[PDB]
Write a protein that binds this DNA or RNA. Structure first.
Ligand SMILES: [Mg+2]
Ligand SMILES: [Mg+2]
Ligand SMILES: [Mg+2]
Ligand SMILES: [Mg+2]
Ligand SMILES: [Mg+2]
Ligand SMILES: [Mg+2]
Ligand SMILES: [Mg+2]
Ligand SMILES: [Mg+2]
Ligand SMILES: [Mg+2]
Ligand SMILES: [Mg+2]
Ligand SMILES: [Mg+2]
Ligand SMILES: [Mg+2]
Ligand SMILES: [Mg+2]
Ligand SMILES: [Mg+2]
Ligand SMILES: [Mg+2]
Ligand SMILES: [Mg+2]
Ligand SMILES: [Zn+2]
Lengths: 156, 211, 224
RNA sequence: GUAAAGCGCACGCAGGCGGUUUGUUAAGUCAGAUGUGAAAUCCCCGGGCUCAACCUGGGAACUGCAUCUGAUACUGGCAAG
RNA sequence: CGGCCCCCUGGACGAAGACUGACGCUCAGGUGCGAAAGCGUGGGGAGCAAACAGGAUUAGAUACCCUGGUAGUCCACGCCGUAAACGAUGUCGACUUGGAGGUUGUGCCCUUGAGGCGUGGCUUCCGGAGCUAACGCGUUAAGUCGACCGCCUGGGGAGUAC
RNA sequence: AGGUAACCGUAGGGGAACCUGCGGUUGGAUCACCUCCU
């Protein structure tokens, strides 16, 4: 019942005594469509292996975000490795308006309505390195209430 | 870096011969000449019957040849009428009353001959060699093998240069004499030329000599 | 364990004042003869509260990994694990013992195959030199994975002696979320131990005290 | 810091910014009112051309400006520390 | 900025107090200082040494080597105002785990002695969080923050033309 | 003793490549290609 999506595949070199030896790095995310998602990235000698192993690491690392109703709970940004990502909840039925790399991440997590935008460099691994962190840093209307020792309406 | 025929060295150890009759020198050359000719005739005939192994053994008053294939009914046709006519044509090409018999194969994707020839056939189909040999090794190891190696050489995909490649998977111990290594070779005649294919399957170790 | 029970064993003993770690200041009674003295007033309640958690884990069918690689205390930790039907690491810790679980399972399978093969037979079929070589490999695997051949899966709790010496194990555990129970001398960094016991980790007497008390409470947790 | 980008260093006028308490002021600031901010346009709710474009009612809005009356925490002014 | 001595003179720091009562920070223009080379005037001139004079060597040597040797190098007084003038890091303030030092103070205790506990200033090296593209930085931040100034906008063309 | 280059400011020579003088800085080597989507 999971959900997966490849993001990008690059052919990386490695120069040896005689010439080089190419390889293949896959990058993918896996989510449950219910605010719980992880990502993976793994090299290999050829594509299906990389796409396979990277797919598996992502089955671990699956953090659980406290989104509400296919949308976030408050605007949020996340900066990692020179990539900046702004996101914010959107109205109902707005959709997933996001650059390529993020769109999958948002999709598999369970998000339905969200605005987004990247900044700086747009290296895909960096922005997901920069997105999931941003996601988990959301705060439920009770995570605060708990950590602020109040009732929900006492903040709302 | 040339290897040595993995079948040959394991003869007597774990690999029985493909011809078990005995004879003296006087009648030796012609003997293998005859059984060679019957091998060649057969391999021309049953090309569609997935034939893998063909052994000639000659008792003093008769000859008898045995066939390991994966398409038994094909060879038998109906009432062995094709089998019977093969028996006739071999009895005359061997000039000795023959008696042929077949012993089919159960794991057609697990012997080197059938897999190599299937590979080379698909190569004539101009399917992509890479995915082909990959399916080969996958089916093999999936079926319960312990090692598979395939190697294809010469003018790949019609390339104007000979890009010889290979693939390995599982475990194929080539220096361990006691190892059961099935091994075979076949060939494809492309428009662009001829391409060689070698195949190894390792079904594990056997302990206690040929017995 | 009572403060008097520890003190006679020497639990209060510590490393030199020259060699200590910054986070250990709360747990340090003071110094004498340039020697760090550990405070039993903190040691006893923390050990008791850790024993509570260990009893809980073992009383929900927990698998316990006793960890210590000291050449003096290896057999003590092994016997400690045997006294409570648990699993242990008494030889040098191998990186990825927990994180690289799949490889350990393949090595476990080879150890199981070798012992089964010797009982089944075919050693006579092997050349005498080959059969002896197989026996040597079986002995080496038994020396290495003797404790974890029957662990089956990743353990539910870890007990560590001299957490600084075994730092790779605790890093792995934290990466897996497996809880760490560890005897922490003054020179160790206590961040990786979720239930931290500050105490001597070299002295055979105090180590055996820790192990015996833990094993008694583990058998108690099992008995229900 | 090394990708372009810290003046060679210092002093210093103009300028910018300013610890802490009270009082005062009401300038900034905030609140309210009032005037004004053409119509069209844009937007909402309508209506009319068979639909639509288009045309049209009403509204919203025009974030502004001015004036008056308040508010005194904040920043400023004044006084006293 | 390096012999020693005197004379004239600036700053820093510590100790304890007493006084002043926000007198502050920053700073466009502005002003001054500003390595070496250079210029002017006069002096000086051992050593060294661009240029130059030769020797050699070299395809040739216009260079490298030798022998020389002027300006210069020094002094006074002007002038020039540039350097990878660099920590390639503007100035001031507050805050944020540690270890090893160096250096200069100063309190107490060792009876003091040799020494043990304090508490400053400056400085060096590790390294935590954190930060960084990375390298790294890391209480002397390139951390967390304020205030003010200077500066940047693809590379050459060009710090050149006017 | 380890040992050896670059570059800055400037002056002279030099046809220019550049070489010398004075001081300053470490920023104390040099390069790089045949195969390719699950
Ligand atoms: Mg040979
Ligand atoms: Mg500069
Ligand atoms: Mg100043
Ligand atoms: Mg003012
Ligand atoms: Mg003020
Ligand atoms: Mg209008
Ligand atoms: Mg209508
Ligand atoms: Mg005021
Ligand atoms: Mg000069
Ligand atoms: Mg002069
Ligand atoms: Mg000269
Ligand atoms: Mg300059
Ligand atoms: Mg300098
Ligand atoms: Mg500077
Ligand atoms: Mg100019
Ligand atoms: Mg010259
Ligand atoms: Zn210890």
């Amino acid at each position: 019942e999971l959900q997966e999506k490849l993001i990008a595949v690059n052919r990386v070199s490695k120069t040896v005594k005689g010439g080089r030896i190419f390889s293949f790095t896959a990058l993918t995310v896996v989510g449950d469509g219910n605010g719980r998602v992880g990502f993976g990235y793994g090299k290999a000698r050829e594509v299906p292996a990389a796409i396979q192993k990277a797919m598996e690491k992502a089955r671990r690392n699956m953090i659980n975000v406290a989104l509400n109703n296919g949308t976030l709970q408050h605007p949020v940004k996340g900066v990692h490795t020179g990539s900046r990502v702004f996101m914010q909840p959107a109205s109902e039925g707005t959709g997933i308006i996001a650059g390529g790399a993020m769109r999958a991440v948002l999709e598999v997590a369970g998000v339905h309505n969200v605005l987004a935008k990247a900044y700086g460099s747009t290296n895909p691994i960096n922005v997901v390195r920069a997105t999931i962190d941003g996601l988990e840093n959301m705060n439920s209307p009770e995570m605060v209430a708990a950590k602020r020792g109040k009732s929900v309406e006492e903040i709302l | 870096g040339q290897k040595v025929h993995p079948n040959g060295i394991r003869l007597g150890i774990v690999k029985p011969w493909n011809s078990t009759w005995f004879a003296n020198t006087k009648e030796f050359a012609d003997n293998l000449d005859s059984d060679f000719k019957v091998r060649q005739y057969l391999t021309k005939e049953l090309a569609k019957a997935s034939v893998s192994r063909i052994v000639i053994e000659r008792p003093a008053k008769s000859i008898r040849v045995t066939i390991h294939t994966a398409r038994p009914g094909i060879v038998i046709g109906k009432k062995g009428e094709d089998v019977e006519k093969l028996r006739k044509v071999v009895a005359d090409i061997a000039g000795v009353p023959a008696q042929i018999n077949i012993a089919e194969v159960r794991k057609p994707e697990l012997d080197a001959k059938l897999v190599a020839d299937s590979i080379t056939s698909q190569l004539e189909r101009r399917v992509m060699f890479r995915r082909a040999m990959k399916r080969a090794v996958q089916n093999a190891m999936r079926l319960g093998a312990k090692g598979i190696k395939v190697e294809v050489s010469g003018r790949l995909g019609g390339a104007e240069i000979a890009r010889t490649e290979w693939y390995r998977e599982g475990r194929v111990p080539l220096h361990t004499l006691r190892a059961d290594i099935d091994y075979n070779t076949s060939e494809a005649h492309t428009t662009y030329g001829v391409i060689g294919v070698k195949v190894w399957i390792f079904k594990g170790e056997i302990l206690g000599g040929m017995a | 364990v009572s403060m008097r029970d520890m003190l006679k064993a020497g639990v209060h003993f510590g490393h030199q004042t020259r060699y200590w770690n910054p986070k250990m200041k709360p747990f340090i009674f003071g110094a004498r003869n340039k020697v760090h003295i550990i405070n039993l007033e903190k040691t006893v309640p923390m050990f008791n509260e850790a024993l509570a958690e260990l009893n809980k884990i073992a009383s929900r069918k927990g698998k316990i990994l006793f960890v210590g690689t000291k050449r003096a205390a290896s057999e003590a930790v092994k016997d400690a694990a045997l006294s409570c039907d648990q699993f242990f690491v008494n030889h040098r810790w191998l990186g990825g013992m927990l994180t690289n679980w799949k490889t350990v399972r393949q090595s476990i399978k080879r150890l199981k195959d070798l012992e089964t093969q010797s009982q089944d037979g075919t050693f006579d079929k092997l050349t005498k030199k080959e059969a002896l070589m197989r026996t040597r490999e079986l002995e080496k695997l038994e020396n290495s994975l003797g404790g974890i051949k029957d662990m089956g899966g990743l353990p539910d709790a870890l007990f560590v002696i001299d957490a600084d010496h075994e730092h790779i194990a605790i890093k792995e555990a934290n990466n897996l979320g497996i809880p760490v129970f560890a005897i922490v001398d003054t020179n160790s960094d206590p961040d990786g131990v979720d239930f931290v016991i500050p105490g001597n980790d070299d002295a055979i007497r105090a180590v055996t005290l820790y192990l015996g008390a833990v094993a008694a409470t583990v058998r108690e947790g099992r008995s229900q």
